[PDB]
Structure formats: structure tokens, C-alpha cells
From Swiss-Prot:
Chief location bin: secreted
Protein name: Type-2 ice-structuring protein
Keywords assigned: Antifreeze protein, Disulfide bond, Lectin, Secreted, Signal
Originating organism: Brachyopsis segaliensis (Sea poacher)
Domain (C-type lectin): residue spans on this chain: 14-126
Length: 130
């Protein structure tokens, strides 16, 4: 269609996507599985515009959809979209395979870092708008 977009209840609209703030802390793998049960993925981020929109939703560290757990330093988004934007914190990522899941950190700018996937954090999901 070519009419106004909506999001399901509980999700918020930015552009062509809907976002869900999951306040329950969980491992990266549980957070991704949670987003898949809800029809989406942990959020991928493709511009500073998206970075800033998501920054404004969330209340602290959040898991997002990046991981590099197969080949060290080879980042992918769980939703299959391109890694065409990055905003890693200074000196990051460390690209150590033990610490291979991506999060927005507690810095105000929500710069990204790669942490152990078992760390327990809130998260953000995304999926296409309706």
C-alpha cells in the first residue's frame, strides 16, 4: 500500500520500521529469541538517525542485533541487513571471540561495544511497519 504506516501496540514507529523496548534483562541469545517470537529481531542500525532515535527510546545499556561469534571481528546483523553503519566506542570493537555480542553502552551517545553474550541487559527489537 501507499498509506500511513502503523506499528502494533507496544511498538513505536520510525521511518519504515517499528521498535520494541524490552525492559526485562536477558542474555543476548535470549533477547534475540524474544524478538523473533515477537515477529522481529534485535534491532539493526543503519544511520546516525536510527542511532539517535533508538538512543532516545532506551533507558541504559541495550543489546542490539550485532554479533561476531563465528569469525573473529566479522560482524553481522541477525536480521540479515548490511553492516553499512558503525558507531563503535573509542578503541572498540576488541574483536575477541569470547566477547562477541554487540550492545549500545551506558555512554550517553550509546556508542557500541562487544561484550560477553551471557551478560544480562535490556534490549531493543525491530521489524517492518504495517
Amino acid at each position: 500500500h501507499h498509506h500511513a504506516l502503523v506499528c502494533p501496540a507496544g511498538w513505536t514507529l520510525h521511518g519504515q520500521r517499528c521498535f520494541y523496548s524490552e525492559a526485562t534483562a536477558m542474555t543476548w541469545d535470549l533477547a534475540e529469541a524474544n524478538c523473533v517470537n515477537k515477529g522481529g529481531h534485535l534491532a539493526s542500525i543503519h544511520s546516525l538517525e536510527e542511532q539517535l532515535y533508538i538512543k532516545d527510546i532506551v533507558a541504559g545499556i541495550v543489546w542490539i542485533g550485532g554479533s561476531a561469534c563465528k569469525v573473529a571481528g566479522a560482524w553481522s546483523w541477525t536480521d540479515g541487513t548490511p553492516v553499512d553503519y558503525r558507531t563503535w566506542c573509542p578503541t572498540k570493537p576488541n574483536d575477541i571471540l569470547s566477547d562477541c555480542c554487540m550492545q549500545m553502552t551506558a555512554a550517553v551517545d550509546k556508542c557500541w561495544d562487544d561484550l560477553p553474550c551471557p551478560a544480562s541487559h535490556a534490549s531493543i527489537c525491530a521489524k517492518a511497519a504495517i
